[PDB]
Design an enzyme around this catalytic site. Structure first.
Site: not given
Ligand SMILES: CO[C@H]1C[C@@H]2CC[C@@H](C)[C@@](O)(O2)C(=O)C(=O)N2CCCC[C@H]2C(=O)O[C@H]([C@H](C)C[C@@H]2CC[C@@H](O)[C@H](OC)C2)CC(=O)[C@H](C)/C=C(\C)[C@@H](O)[C@@H](OC)C(=O)[C@H](C)C[C@H](C)/C=C/C=C/C=C/1C
Lengths: 95, 132
Positions: B49, B59-60, B79, B105, B122
């Site tokens: 993506y 932003f990504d 999201i 968001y 996206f």
């Molecule tokens: C470096 O790249 C980042 C992704 C970046 C962050 C900033 C955003 C702009 C963005 O650029 O992606 C982006 O384009 C975006 O908007 N995304 C990512 C792709 C899917 C759609 C969206 C999204 O939901 O991001 C997500 C968004 C930012 C936050 C979540 C949005 C929905 C909400 O319900 C959640 O509440 C909890 C928070 C980030 C993610 O997709 C990651 C995978 C998921 C989480 C962090 C949470 O679900 C978390 O909750 C504890 C978890 O259970 C995870 C598995 C725990 C482990 C340790 C953390 C992993 C972190 C991975 C981070 C990654 C790959």
């Protein structure tokens, strides 16, 4: 084969850090909750199970920590995305 | 300067794939997949993506090639727009999703990358998906 404690501590801490960082925009909090976990990996006498964990994930965790240090020095947000990529990869391997 | 805008295209032609039809998530298919099946709730999903603000600001950029981005579908890990959008995709498919802040968001955003009340674009390629 791999330390249950190290596995459980990184799972718990990575989850906390993600909520601090993504949930609360708390970068300082994120670094703080992971900092003693990184320091664990680095410091002396280790058992067989924790040596095995460090062999499996230590390089990635070390690299993740270095991207965070880079972020501090430069302010480059892409350094944090690099760190989170590595943290997530490890989080997935251990879950 | 006189060329197509993918973002304007999804805004002006995209199908509304929300169940309420509230315009919250709009979808355009760029490349049709081969699959019969769509990913189900709880599936592990692999994608490429990239993401852009509706004004064009990226932003990504770093997840569109090489190692897939993985997540579990229908869990609130990502999201709401992605839980809705990716669930409509077939394997091999590339689509564009335009996501209103209520499905992304909200008024908090995700600063510094995502400002408050931001509509997000996206491009997603569904690579594969698994039940377990
Ligand atoms: C470096 O790249 C980042 C992704 C970046 C962050 C900033 C955003 C702009 C963005 O650029 O992606 C982006 O384009 C975006 O908007 N995304 C990512 C792709 C899917 C759609 C969206 C999204 O939901 O991001 C997500 C968004 C930012 C936050 C979540 C949005 C929905 C909400 O319900 C959640 O509440 C909890 C928070 C980030 C993610 O997709 C990651 C995978 C998921 C989480 C962090 C949470 O679900 C978390 O909750 C504890 C978890 O259970 C995870 C598995 C725990 C482990 C340790 C953390 C992993 C972190 C991975 C981070 C990654 C790959």
């Amino acid at each position: 084969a791999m330390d249950p404690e190290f596995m459980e501590m990184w799972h718990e801490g990575l989850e906390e850090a993600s909520r601090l960082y993504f949930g609360e925009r708390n970068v300082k909090g994120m670094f703080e909750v992971l900092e003693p976990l990184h320091a664990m990996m680095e410091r002396g006498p280790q058992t067989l199970k924790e040596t095995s964990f460090n062999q499996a994930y230590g390089r990635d965790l070390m690299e993740a920590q270095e991207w965070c240090r880079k972020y501090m020095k430069s302010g480059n947000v892409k350094d944090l995305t690099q760190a989170w990529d590595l943290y997530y990869h490890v989080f997935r391997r251990i879950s | 300067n006189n060329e197509e805008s993918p973002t304007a295209t999804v805004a002006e032609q995209g199908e509304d794939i929300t169940s309420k039809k509230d315009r919250g998530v709009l979808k355009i298919v760029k490349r049709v997949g081969n699959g019969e099946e769509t990913p189900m709730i709880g599936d592990k999903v692999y994608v490429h993506y990239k993401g852009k603000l509706s004004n064009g600001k990226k932003f990504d950029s770093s997840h569109d090639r090489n190692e897939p981005f993985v997540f579990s579908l229908g869990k609130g890990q990502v999201i709401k727009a992605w839980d809705i959008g990716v669930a409509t995709m077939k394997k091999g498919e590339i689509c564009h999703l335009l996501c209103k802040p209520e499905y992304a968001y909200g008024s908090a955003g995700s600063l510094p990358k995502i400002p408050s009340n931001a509509t997000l674009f996206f491009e997603i390629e569904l690579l594969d998906f698994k039940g377990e």
